[PDB]
């Protein structure tokens, strides 16, 4: 069916049909225009008329040019001939290596799984970092959040995560990035063409075979409009679902960041006719976002892991984005620009950050404790702080200081040279097992390295490297 | 968006051609009250910050001079006034 | 039909027939006007208005049209006929605006002449992809010590130059334009030459005619133009300017040629943006800033890339300007820019009261690139600097006992201290790299430890003109190798042998 | 209800009352004919160009040179005085969605 | 013709239904013949008593120093992961063996989970954690969760109020949970600003009060001429910050018969659960 | 041309003309009512209605007043005959000494200095005052904060920067009063007369001879309304750009109080129903203090 644009404001359009309307969802093609400009039908209002949300620029539009239903929602292709390749949120590939090949394509939009096809079974995740694995442990087929300002660590900790788990993983995964920099983007696909996660080969005739691959790229990015970036994640989210559901293997799912995904909104509801909320975001802040992450669970036919990393506006946690992301995750973690100044990487802020996958009946009563244990150390630190700013260590009584000397010191520990911060550290990385994290808790909590210096923690890992530093320290 | 103008009993009269405009500018209707403030057909003429009457002897106050309409302000209760009542300046 | 009935009483009904490539004006106010007609109007057109005022045509209603002024709201009357130029918001470019201080839309300002015109690049252009990038591999040689050294701006890199006002970053800009002289006269090969832009918005004019003086004093405008948008200019312009002079620079960058772009401050820009959104009736948000300045910044600054070995080669830095209130970076805006670079260059109050100029604090100054963006020559001397000031960092704060200390913390303390006092500059007077690092290998070798603190500056001086009269030699064999070999060493430390023989110092 | 509507209304009542139906009716559709056939009516109507003084010249114009009432011309006046001569195609088709 | 309506009675025990009692469970139909309105005038002055009767919540500071009663609302507030689920989750668990160990329908306590703007994985664990133990032949849930939409989070703990006052008209004694209202209220704002009226303070409506006051008044004990029964209310809340001076804690807390405040610093400290017995009465 | 007013909202008023309507920043004279009223055209409206803001109050105002446009915007004259006299924002005198007879009318919105036609080479002001020129050195075409109240001297050091400033630099001077006490504007009055700075000489006829001054005066009294207070400081500078250009001497400007300029701004674009920025201030509040600091 073929319509008309009647309006256009920046990163929407209204267009008018004649005969029969297209239902909502609904992908539309504009003709007379350079790029494949795409429209996503949002509302009706009347008159035959219709608003739609453009998922590239506007310039060039005119009041009067010709629209095409295509009949049906966007449709991202879907298959192993997805993997080792980029494709933006309308399937287009940007990779430069061909068209894809794929058979079979799937809607952008899709309900999530029932109630019932739901299997809560609880795992854990080998990271190699001591605070999520000691006092937020990650929960195999559960979703994982990574809350943080801006310079704090997220993009690293995930590029960390990618490398201690997707290339020890044997399934398949997928990464989303939704308004983060291109040049990281670029970087990643480097990285995975090096580690063999993605297997390129070029065949004489300028043709790509991609066999071996275990690693899809959806890429909208700052350089994008918002409608190319409130879609990207249902894009990814789409070629996940097709391996967990038809192929039933279990798949990692990276985002970078989610709260961009809200953002659009914002830059939308505003053009789209709505009333805006508390802080200038959508009424639709929360189904928007639920209908995203509900897609996102382990099944019976399979499981999606997920990696969320979710910006902070102005350090804020009470803002509305970050709340409401709260409430869909499994574990947590909670990035700190207070601890990222003392050097301390991550800057993982322990006592915000928490688990579901903490209790006793799924780690042991000894992992329960330390972690607990810890805690408590952390806090009755904390309560101190005021008192040692204005007065001082020394009207602290002699408990409180030996506190205070071990909450340092487990803080200085609790700090791991990754191997991607190579480049601007210098030191090489440090994977660490869990037993080892929990012996080493257990000896600073009773007293057994209250001897060390607190210079001797920080960046190490285990305790013999500790140890060791304080040798070479005494000289 | 209507205008009082614009409500179905004076069409009813411009569309019957009736130019009975003699109504001067010191006499005006009442076409909406609420919380103390009353709006008026009418007037053309009065002052800002000039005092008006209504019929059941209260007065009020001009200040929202508008193309269409006139704002006052009462000096008493609402429950006097109504809507059709007249309006006369002092 | 019935036209005649129109043609003869309205006396001109025939003309006005035609609303496809001619409107009329309807309402203006606020920067907005309206306009009834141009049907077949592009969005984003420039439009033509009757007193040669233009502006952009921005929103399309379904019969009124929305447009931008650039200009003041009294050239554009109710009533005024309005054009269609037929072409998108676009700037001229390429060499031409060399020399030339021109306005948001390529106009001239400074009263020289008119400008040359290619195809007139358009302005709110895409950027580039993943593919055709390249990662950062070669440097920008700003002339600052501290920088080069420890916060190293590479070619294809967006660092960020955030602090308080009345800090020192317009002399970071300035300089880093200064240093670019020596190495572009000896070249005469655009591959390695680097231009540059200026962009100034919402800036004092007498600041932008102060630089534009000094840059003509020194020599350094064959290689630069300057876009300014300042305070009295409205606010679609200071929209405006940045993307203009990311379009100017997006020529060398497809060409090959390298070019460097200053923004000053993008903060107002973002004010700027503010206003036109509050003046169009859009809801506000977190400090009234609407959620479209994050779109704004980031397709400004993701421009800014290295482009491959088959797209040209070509690169284009940014070096974006943030004016903070009492230090604040955990801000919005700050926040914005901070998730949008590659870098940051902080700022102090303090060390700029103390003395200490340029105040560039390093402990909260990164760089992601880092080493990459360096040579070989810098990288051995820099590694040691930046871990000797961390060493500096973290016990400097029991210096007041240094006589209860051990003889290990007040080392620490001295070679600190003369590094800090090593990485002062005067205001325009960079240096080349070759000296810079032979200066650093002189402070990384105990040579100054026992020296005095303020001997540090003229020893400097009188080293300087020691190295450019005798061992030139050593100069270009570090600028041709970018390596500090064992005999280059050796000769760099029998000369400093010689220097502190020859010359006296307090201690 | 709406602003049509009430116009509509009002000139129903009033064609209803004094004068005729079937004069209104016919002046309706031919004006609406000419509406969506001249091609310039209707521009003439939309464009702001146009004074209010030479709208009403016109609209008078055309009241002597076709047959037409005095209503249908209080009509286009006030049409006119509250700034609703683009509605009158839609008033029409209310005047014909009455038949 | 119809206004909204839910089905009642004790085909609802042991299943887990949406806000419109349409059931999710996959296991067969509601079997239920009389439905009740969601939207009610709750009881008057006189068909009521003083509550006597407590409400064992199997908690050792809660039954001891912040005491529940029958009849009763008391309010679960709280910041995030501090122990409020776990806490309405004991009270349920705790009643399997009063009730095993009697017929008298007027001593057993049956219980509702009304789960608004959580996720399925959270309604399933609970379901599982409640199966485990045997603790779903006395429950029922309400399950109205974040991708369903905002007016089944608006109507299901108005449903799960009618659900109940089929126990409280009969002579049974219910305790119903929300889990967050505050979700309920989002949910409502978003209609609300949906629909085009006015917002107000953190543009919610002026009508949130009456939501809260409409759900919870009817809570109530009844007189012995109207049976006898009770319907108690668990409320949840999830403050930001610990700031009980907001728009919404502010109101439930000024019209409920109590508080169970919990505290992040008591949680990390060791005191698990996190009740401060300062700020919690009854 | 001649047009009627259509509406009157407080200090906002709205206005029909029949053809050619008046361009921005235009005034418009008030026929009909004692009070010269003089409005300042802001926005464009359709219906060949403008809306205006009102200098001065607008009781007793009616709709269908005829009203005149002037042609031009708001002509404050200029000279140095505009020494030693005291004058509102439309340029009229408060002094009670008769009218200004000069021979020249400037506008208050001006377009600033262009890029050309501005000094590369900065300099110092020798003032006369020690710890001044010791360890605040202030500038040529620079504007200087002065934090301090009453009880401070600060009056005595703004007519010694007068006197010291016209004896050795030759140049004149200029006080603006942007929403002042006008208790405080008597005094200045009579303190500026007592030390010379003012020479207000009786004549023989009953007129005054105001010979040789220093400063003029330019009072936007606190009692006058939103549109005035907001106007103030353009004609003292336009006062000050006749100096400046065809006089080719330094001149002074005192402002006092830069705030009340910003407040008028505030109040003037909430009238009009502009959205309010982050404190509530304008969202046109750069830009007007660059329209102002840029001259
Ligand atoms: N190395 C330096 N040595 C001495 N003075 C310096 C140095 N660097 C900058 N300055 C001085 O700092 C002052 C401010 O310079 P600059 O304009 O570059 O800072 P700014 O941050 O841009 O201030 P603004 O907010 O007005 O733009 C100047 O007077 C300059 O001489
Ligand atoms: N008595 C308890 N002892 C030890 N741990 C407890 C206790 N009560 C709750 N917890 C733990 O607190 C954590 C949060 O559990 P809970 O489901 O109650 O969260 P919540 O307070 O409802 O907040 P939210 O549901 O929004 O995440 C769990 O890890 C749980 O094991
Ligand atoms: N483990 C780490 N070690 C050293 N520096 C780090 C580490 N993590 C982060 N940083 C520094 O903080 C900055 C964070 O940038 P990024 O990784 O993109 O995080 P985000 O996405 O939150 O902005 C980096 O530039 C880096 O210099
Ligand atoms: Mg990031
Ligand atoms: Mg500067
Ligand atoms: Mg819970």
């Given at each position: 069916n073929?319509?008309?644009?009647?309006?256009?404001?920046?990163?929407?359009v209204?267009?008018?049909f004649?005969?029969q309307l297209?239902p909502?969802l609904?992908?539309l093609?504009?003709?007379?225009?350079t790029?494949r400009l795409?429209?996503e039908?949002?509302?009706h209002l009347?008159?035959?008329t219709?608003?739609?949300?453009?998922?590239?620029?506007t310039?060039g539009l005119?009041?009067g040019?010709?629209?095409v239903?295509?009949?049906?929602?966007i449709?991202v292709?879907v298959?192993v001939?997805?993997?080792?390749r980029?494709?933006?949120?309308?399937?287009?590939p940007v990779?430069?290596?061909?068209?894809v090949?794929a058979?079979?394509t799937?809607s952008i939009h899709?309900?999530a799984?029932?109630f019932?096809?739901?299997?809560?079974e609880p795992?854990?995740?080998?990271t190699?970092?001591?605070?999520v694995d000691?006092?937020?442990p990650?929960?195999?087929?559960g979703?994982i959040?990574?809350?943080?300002?801006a310079?704090?660590g997220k993009?690293?900790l995930?590029?960390?995560?990618?490398n201690?788990?997707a290339?020890k993983?044997?399934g398949?995964?997928?990464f989303?990035?939704?308004?983060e920099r291109?040049?990281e983007?670029?970087?990643l696909?480097?990285?995975?063409m090096?580690?063999?996660?993605?297997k390129?080969?070029?065949?004489?005739?300028?043709?790509?075979?991609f066999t071996?691959?275990?690693?899809?790229?959806v890429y909208?990015?700052?350089?994008?409009?918002?409608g190319?970036?409130?879609?990207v994640?249902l894009?990814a989210?789409?070629?996940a679902?097709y391996?967990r559901?038809?192929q039933?293997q279990?798949?990692?799912?990276?985002?970078?960041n989610?709260?961009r995904?809200?953002q659009?909104?914002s830059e939308?509801?505003?053009?789209?006719g709505?009333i805006?909320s508390?802080?200038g975001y959508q009424p639709?802040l929360?189904?928007?976002?639920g209908?995203?992450?509900?897609?996102?669970?382990t099944?019976?036919?399979?499981?999606?892991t997920?990696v969320?990393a979710?910006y902070?506006p102005?350090?804020?946690?009470?803002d509305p984005?970050?709340?409401?992301?709260?409430?869909?995750?499994?574990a947590?973690?909670?990035?700190?620009?207070?601890?990222?100044?003392?050097?301390?990487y991550?800057?993982?802020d322990?006592?915000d950050s928490?688990?579901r996958?903490?209790?006793?009946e799924?780690?042991?009563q000894?992992?329960?404790?330390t972690?607990?244990a810890?805690?408590?150390?952390?806090?009755?630190?904390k309560s101190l702080?005021?008192?040692i700013?204005?007065?001082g260590?020394?009207?602290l009584?002699e408990?409180?200081?030996?506190?205070?000397?071990?909450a340092?010191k487990?803080?200085?520990?609790?700090?791991?040279?990754?191997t991607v911060?190579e480049v601007?550290?210098?030191?090489?990385?440090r994977?660490?097992?869990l037993?080892?994290?929990i012996?080493?808790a257990?000896?600073?909590?009773?007293?057994e390295?209250?001897?060390?210096?607190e210079?001797?923690?920080?960046?190490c890992?285990?305790?013999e490297?500790?140890?060791?530093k304080?040798?070479?320290?005494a000289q | 968006?209507?205008?009082?103008?614009?409500?179905?009993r004076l069409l009813?009269?411009?569309?019957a051609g009736w130019?009975?405009?003699?109504?001067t500018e010191?006499?005006g209707?009442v076409?909406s009250?609420?919380?103390?403030?009353a709006?008026?057909?009418?007037?053309?003429?009065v002052?800002?910050?000039?005092?008006?009457?209504?019929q059941?002897?209260?007065?009020?106050?001009?200040?929202?001079?508008?193309?269409?309409?006139?704002?006052?302000?009462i000096?008493?209760?609402d429950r006097?006034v109504?809507?059709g009542?007249?309006?006369?300046?002092? | 039909?019935?036209?005649?009935?129109?043609?003869?009483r309205?006396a001109?009904?025939?003309?006005?027939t035609?609303?496809?490539?001619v409107?009329?004006?309807?309402?203006?106010?606020?920067?907005?006007?309206?306009?009834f007609?141009l049907?077949?109007?592009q969005?984003?057109?420039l439009?033509?208005?009757?007193?040669?005022?233009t502006?952009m045509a921005?929103?399309?209603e379904?019969?009124?049209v929305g447009?931008v002024?650039?200009?003041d709201d009294?050239?554009?009357?109710?009533?005024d006929?309005?054009?269609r130029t037929?072409?998108?918001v676009?700037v001229?470019i390429?060499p031409?605006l060399?020399?030339?201080?021109?306005?948001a839309?390529?106009?001239?300002?400074?009263?020289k002449?008119?400008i040359?015109?290619?195809?007139?690049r358009?302005?709110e252009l895409?950027?580039p992809?993943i593919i055709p990038?390249?990662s950062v591999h070669?440097?920008?040689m700003?002339?600052?010590?501290?920088?080069?050294?420890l916060?190293?701006?590479?070619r294809?890199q967006?660092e960020?130059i955030?602090?308080?006002?009345?800090?020192?970053?317009?002399?970071?800009?300035?300089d880093?334009?200064?240093?670019?002289?020596?190495?572009?006269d000896?070249?005469?090969?655009?591959?390695?030459?680097?231009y540059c832009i200026y962009?100034?918005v919402?800036?004092?004019?007498?600041?932008?005619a102060?630089?534009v003086?000094?840059?003509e004093?020194?020599?350094?405008?064959?290689?630069?133009?300057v876009?300014?948008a300042?305070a009295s200019?409205?606010?679609?312009?200071?929209?405006?300017?940045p993307?203009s002079?990311?379009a100017?620079?997006?020529?060398?960058?497809?060409?090959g040629?390298h070019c460097?772009?200053?923004?000053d401050?993008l903060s107002?820009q973002?004010?700027?943006y503010?206003?036109?959104?509050?003046?169009?009736?859009?809801?506000?948000?977190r400090?009234?800033?609407?959620?479209?300045?994050?779109?704004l910044?980031?397709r400004?600054?993701?421009?800014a890339?290295?482009?491959?070995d088959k797209?040209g080669?070509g690169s284009?830095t940014?070096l974006?300007?943030?004016?903070?209130?009492?230090?604040d970076?955990?801000?919005?805006?700050?926040?914005?820019?901070i998730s949008?670079?590659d870098?940051?260059?902080?700022?102090?109050?303090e060390?700029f009261y103390?003395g200490?100029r340029?105040?560039?604090?390093?402990?909260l100054?990164?760089?992601?690139?880092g080493?990459?963006?360096?040579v070989?020559?810098m990288?051995?001397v820099?590694?040691?600097?930046?871990?000797?000031?961390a060493?500096?960092?973290?016990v400097?704060?029991?210096?007041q006992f240094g006589s209860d200390?051990?003889?290990?913390?007040?080392?620490?303390?001295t070679?600190?201290?003369?590094?800090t006092?090593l990485l002062?500059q005067?205001?325009?007077?960079?240096?080349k790299?070759?000296?810079?690092?032979?200066?650093?290998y002189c402070?990384?070798?105990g040579?100054l430890?026992?020296?005095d603190?303020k001997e540090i500056?003229r020893?400097?001086?009188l080293?300087?003109?020691?190295?450019?009269?005798?061992?030139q030699?050593?100069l270009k064999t570090?600028?041709?190798?970018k390596?500090?070999?064992?005999?280059t060493?050796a000769?760099?430390?029998?000369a400093?042998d010689e220097?502190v023989?020859?010359n006296?110092?307090?201690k | 209800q709406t602003?049509?509507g009430?116009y509509?209304?009002?000139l129903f009542?009033?064609?209803?009352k004094k004068?005729?139906?079937?004069k209104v009716?016919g002046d309706?559709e031919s004006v609406?004919n000419?509406?969506?056939?001249?091609?310039?009516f209707?521009?003439?109507?939309?464009?702001p160009?146009?004074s209010?003084?030479?709208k009403?010249?016109?609209?008078?114009?055309?009241v002597?040179?076709?047959?037409?009432?005095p209503?249908?011309?209080?009509?286009?006046?006030?049409?006119?005085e509250?700034?609703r001569?683009?509605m009158?195609?839609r008033?029409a088709?209310?005047?014909?969605?009455?038949?």
């Amino acid at each position: 069916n073929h319509g008309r644009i009647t309006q256009v404001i920046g990163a929407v359009v209204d267009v008018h049909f004649d005969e029969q309307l297209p239902p909502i969802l609904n992908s539309l093609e504009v003709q007379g225009h350079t790029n494949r400009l795409v429209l996503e039908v949002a509302q009706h209002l009347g008159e035959n008329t219709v608003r739609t949300i453009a998922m590239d620029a506007t310039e060039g539009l005119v009041r009067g040019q010709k629209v095409v239903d295509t009949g049906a929602p966007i449709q991202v292709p879907v298959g192993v001939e997805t993997l080792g390749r980029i494709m933006n949120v309308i399937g287009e590939p940007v990779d430069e290596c061909g068209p894809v090949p794929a058979k079979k394509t799937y809607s952008i939009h899709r309900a999530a799984p029932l109630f019932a096809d739901q299997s809560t079974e609880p795992g854990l995740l080998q990271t190699g970092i001591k605070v999520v694995d000691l006092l937020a442990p990650y929960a195999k087929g559960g979703k994982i959040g990574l809350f943080g300002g801006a310079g704090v660590g997220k993009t690293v900790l995930i590029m960390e995560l990618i490398n201690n788990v997707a290339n020890k993983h044997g399934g398949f995964s997928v990464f989303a990035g939704v308004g983060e920099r291109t040049r990281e983007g670029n970087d990643l696909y480097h990285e995975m063409m090096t580690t063999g996660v993605i297997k390129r080969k070029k065949l004489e005739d300028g043709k790509f075979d991609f066999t071996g691959s275990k690693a899809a790229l959806v890429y909208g990015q700052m350089n994008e409009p918002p409608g190319a970036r409130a879609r990207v994640a249902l894009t990814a989210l789409s070629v996940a679902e097709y391996f967990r559901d038809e192929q039933g293997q279990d798949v990692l799912l990276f985002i970078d960041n989610i709260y961009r995904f809200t953002q659009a909104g914002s830059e939308v509801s505003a053009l789209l006719g709505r009333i805006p909320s508390a802080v200038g975001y959508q009424p639709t802040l929360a189904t928007d976002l639920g209908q995203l992450q509900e897609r996102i669970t382990t099944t019976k036919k399979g499981s999606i892991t997920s990696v969320q990393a979710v910006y902070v506006p102005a350090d804020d946690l009470t803002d509305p984005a970050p709340a409401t992301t709260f409430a869909h995750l499994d574990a947590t973690t909670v990035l700190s620009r207070q601890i990222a100044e003392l050097g301390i990487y991550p800057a993982v802020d322990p006592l915000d950050s928490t688990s579901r996958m903490l209790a006793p009946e799924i780690v042991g009563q000894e992992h329960y404790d330390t972690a607990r244990a810890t805690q408590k150390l952390l806090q009755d630190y904390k309560s101190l702080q005021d008192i040692i700013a204005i007065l001082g260590m020394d009207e602290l009584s002699e408990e409180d200081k030996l506190v205070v000397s071990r909450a340092r010191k487990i803080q200085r520990f609790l700090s791991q040279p990754f191997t991607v911060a190579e480049v601007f550290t210098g030191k090489p990385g440090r994977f660490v097992e869990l037993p080892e994290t929990i012996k080493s808790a257990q000896t600073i909590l009773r007293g057994e390295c209250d001897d060390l210096p607190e210079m001797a923690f920080y960046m190490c890992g285990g305790l013999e490297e500790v140890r060791s530093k304080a040798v070479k320290m005494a000289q | 968006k209507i205008s009082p103008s614009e409500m179905s009993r004076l069409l009813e009269e411009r569309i019957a051609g009736w130019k009975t405009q003699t109504s001067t500018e010191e006499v005006g209707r009442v076409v909406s009250v609420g919380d103390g403030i009353a709006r008026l057909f009418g007037l053309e003429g009065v002052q800002a910050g000039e005092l008006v009457e209504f019929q059941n002897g209260m007065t009020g106050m001009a200040l929202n001079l508008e193309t269409d309409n006139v704002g006052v302000v009462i000096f008493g209760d609402d429950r006097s006034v109504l809507e059709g009542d007249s309006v006369k300046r002092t | 039909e019935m036209s005649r009935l129109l043609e003869e009483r309205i006396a001109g009904w025939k003309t006005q027939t035609s609303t496809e490539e001619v409107g009329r004006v309807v309402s203006v106010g606020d920067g907005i006007a309206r306009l009834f007609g141009l049907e077949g109007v592009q969005a984003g057109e420039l439009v033509e208005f009757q007193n040669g005022m233009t502006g952009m045509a921005l929103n399309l209603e379904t019969d009124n049209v929305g447009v931008v002024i650039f200009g003041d709201d009294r050239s554009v009357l109710e009533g005024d006929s309005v054009k269609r130029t037929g072409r998108i918001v676009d700037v001229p470019i390429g060499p031409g605006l060399l020399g030339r201080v021109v306005d948001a839309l390529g106009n001239p300002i400074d009263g020289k002449g008119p400008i040359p015109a290619k195809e007139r690049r358009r302005v709110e252009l895409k950027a580039p992809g993943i593919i055709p990038r390249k990662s950062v591999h070669e440097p920008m040689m700003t002339g600052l010590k501290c920088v080069d050294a420890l916060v190293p701006v590479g070619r294809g890199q967006r660092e960020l130059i955030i602090g308080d006002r009345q800090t020192g970053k317009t002399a970071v800009a300035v300089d880093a334009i200064i240093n670019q002289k020596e190495i572009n006269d000896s070249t005469d090969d655009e591959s390695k030459k680097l231009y540059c832009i200026y962009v100034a918005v919402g800036q004092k004019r007498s600041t932008v005619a102060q630089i534009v003086k000094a840059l003509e004093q020194r020599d350094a405008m064959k290689y630069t133009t300057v876009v300014a948008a300042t305070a009295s200019e409205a606010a679609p312009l200071q929209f405006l300017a940045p993307y203009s002079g990311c379009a100017m620079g997006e020529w060398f960058r497809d060409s090959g040629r390298h070019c460097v772009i200053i923004y000053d401050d993008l903060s107002k820009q973002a004010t700027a943006y503010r206003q036109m959104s509050l003046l169009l009736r859009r809801p506000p948000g977190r400090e009234a800033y609407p959620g479209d300045v994050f779109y704004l910044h980031s397709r400004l600054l993701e421009r800014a890339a290295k482009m491959g070995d088959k797209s040209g080669g070509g690169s284009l830095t940014a070096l974006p300007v943030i004016e903070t209130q009492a230090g604040d970076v955990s801000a919005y805006i700050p926040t914005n820019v901070i998730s949008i670079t590659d870098g940051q260059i902080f700022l102090e109050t303090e060390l700029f009261y103390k003395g200490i100029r340029p105040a560039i604090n390093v402990g909260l100054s990164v760089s992601r690139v880092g080493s990459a963006a360096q040579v070989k020559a810098m990288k051995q001397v820099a590694g040691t600097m930046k871990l000797e000031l961390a060493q500096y960092r973290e016990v400097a704060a029991f210096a007041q006992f240094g006589s209860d200390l051990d003889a290990s913390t007040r080392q620490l303390l001295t070679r600190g201290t003369a590094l800090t006092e090593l990485l002062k500059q005067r205001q325009y007077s960079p240096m080349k790299n070759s000296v810079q690092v032979c200066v650093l290998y002189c402070g990384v070798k105990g040579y100054l430890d026992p020296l005095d603190p303020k001997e540090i500056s003229r020893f400097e001086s009188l080293f300087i003109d020691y190295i450019n009269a005798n061992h030139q030699d050593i100069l270009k064999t570090i600028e041709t190798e970018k390596e500090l070999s064992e005999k280059t060493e050796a000769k760099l430390r029998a000369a400093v042998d010689e220097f502190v023989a020859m010359n006296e110092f307090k201690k | 209800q709406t602003l049509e509507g009430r116009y509509a209304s009002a000139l129903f009542r009033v064609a209803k009352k004094k004068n005729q139906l079937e004069k209104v009716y016919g002046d309706l559709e031919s004006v609406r004919n000419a509406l969506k056939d001249s091609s310039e009516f209707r521009l003439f109507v939309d464009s702001p160009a146009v004074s209010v003084q030479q709208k009403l010249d016109v609209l008078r114009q055309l009241v002597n040179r076709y047959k037409f009432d005095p209503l249908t011309g209080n009509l286009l006046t006030t049409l006119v005085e509250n700034k609703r001569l683009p509605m009158l195609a839609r008033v029409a088709d209310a005047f014909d969605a009455m038949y």
